[PDB]
Each structure stands twice: as C-alpha cells, then as structure tokens.
Amino acid sequence: PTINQLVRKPRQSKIKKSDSPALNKGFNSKKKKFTDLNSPQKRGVCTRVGTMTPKKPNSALRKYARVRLSNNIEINAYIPGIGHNLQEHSVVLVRGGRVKDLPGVRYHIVRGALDTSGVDGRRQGRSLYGTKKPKN
C-alpha cells in the first residue's frame, strides 16, 4: 500500500461484464454493424417454437420459444407462465433478460404487446401472461 509506484504504476478496478451482451442491439444491413443501444422497447419475429424435455429441478413439463432476431444469428427465448401461445410469426414488445432457470436465453414477451393478448384462462392475475380490463 505504497504510493510512489502508484503514479509510476497504477491499479485496476474489479472485473465484471454487463448483462445480455447479444441484446440491447439492432443489427445493421446498410452499414452491416450492430448498434450499442440499451433500448427500452423492441420487437420479436418468429422462426420456430422449440422445446427441450430434460428438466430436473422442476420435474414438470413446459416448452419455450426459438425466436430469431435480426439477420442470421441464433437468438433464444422462453415463455415463463401457465399460458401456452400455440402461435408463431409474431411482432411483439420484448422483455429483456432471463427469468430464473434457463441458460443462455434472455428475451421475452410483455402482456399483450401487439401480437396477441395472452392466455385468457387468467382473470385473477390481472398482471401476468395476458390480463387486460380486470375488475379490481
């Protein structure tokens, strides 16, 4: 803890990397290179539906979504809830980041969000997987 060589030679900070690096980004075609944006809002347009089986910690069954973002790369999602949207090819409002217990996926759906409304079997949630005009 000696200060001579401290202006001769400095120190570092910690070492951390931020969250969702292949997110918060809008891929170019005119100038071909991405934008570092951290946008509030964004879209999702669909390529498949997707589902993998081996689930230990829950040990029930539920699928997810394989939705591609701009212009030739693998981007993957998951539908956290009791609502099955047996759909695809949508145009939505993204939710950024991952919910607990799925590795590598960081992209999601807001309730409603211009494509569908949601799993309409919900009426008590009034704020989960599709819930609009709910008597409070």
Partner 1 sequence: NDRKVYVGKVVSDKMDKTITVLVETYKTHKLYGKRVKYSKKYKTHDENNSAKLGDIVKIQETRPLSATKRFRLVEIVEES
Partner RNA sequence: AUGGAGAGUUUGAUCCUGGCUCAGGAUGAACGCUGGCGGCGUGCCUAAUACAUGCAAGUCGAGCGAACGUUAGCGGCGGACGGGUGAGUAACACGUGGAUAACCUACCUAUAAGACUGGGAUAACUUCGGGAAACCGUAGCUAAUACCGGAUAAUAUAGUGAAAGACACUUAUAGAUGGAUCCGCGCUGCAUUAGCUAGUUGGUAAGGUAACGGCUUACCAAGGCAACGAUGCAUAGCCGACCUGAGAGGGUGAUCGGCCACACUGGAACUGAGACACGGUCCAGACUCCUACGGGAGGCAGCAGUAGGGAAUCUUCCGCAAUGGGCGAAAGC
Partner RNA sequence: CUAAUCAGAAAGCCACGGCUAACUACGUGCCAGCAGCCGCGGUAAUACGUAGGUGGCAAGCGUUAUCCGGAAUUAUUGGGCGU
CA angle 109, 54, 50 (to 5 degrees): 40
Q: What are phi and psi of 121, to 5 degrees?
A: -80, 0
Residues making contact with RNA (CB under 7 A): 1-3, 6, 11-14, 16, 19, 24, 30, 35, 38-43, 57-63, 80-84, 93, 95-97, 99-101, 108, 110-114, 117, 121-129, 131-136
Q: Please report, as residue ranges, which positions from 7 to 46 form the binding site for partner 1 (by CB under 8 A).
A: 7
Residue 24 burial (C-beta neighbours within 10 Å; 0-12, 13-18, 19+): buried
Decide: helix, strand or coil at residue 6: helix
Q: Which helix (H) or strand (E) holds 7?
A: helix 4-8
Binding at 116: pick from RNA, partner 1, none (beta carbon under 5-8 Å per type): none
Binding at 110: pick from RNA, partner 1, none (beta carbon under 5-8 Å per type): RNA
Write down the least CB distance from residue 16 to partner 1, Å: 23
Write down the least CB distance from residue 8 to partner 1, Å: 9
Structure tokens that stand for 131 in this block = 């819930």
Of the listed pieces 3-11, 15-23, 53-61, 90-98, which binds partner 1 according to CB under 8 A? 3-11
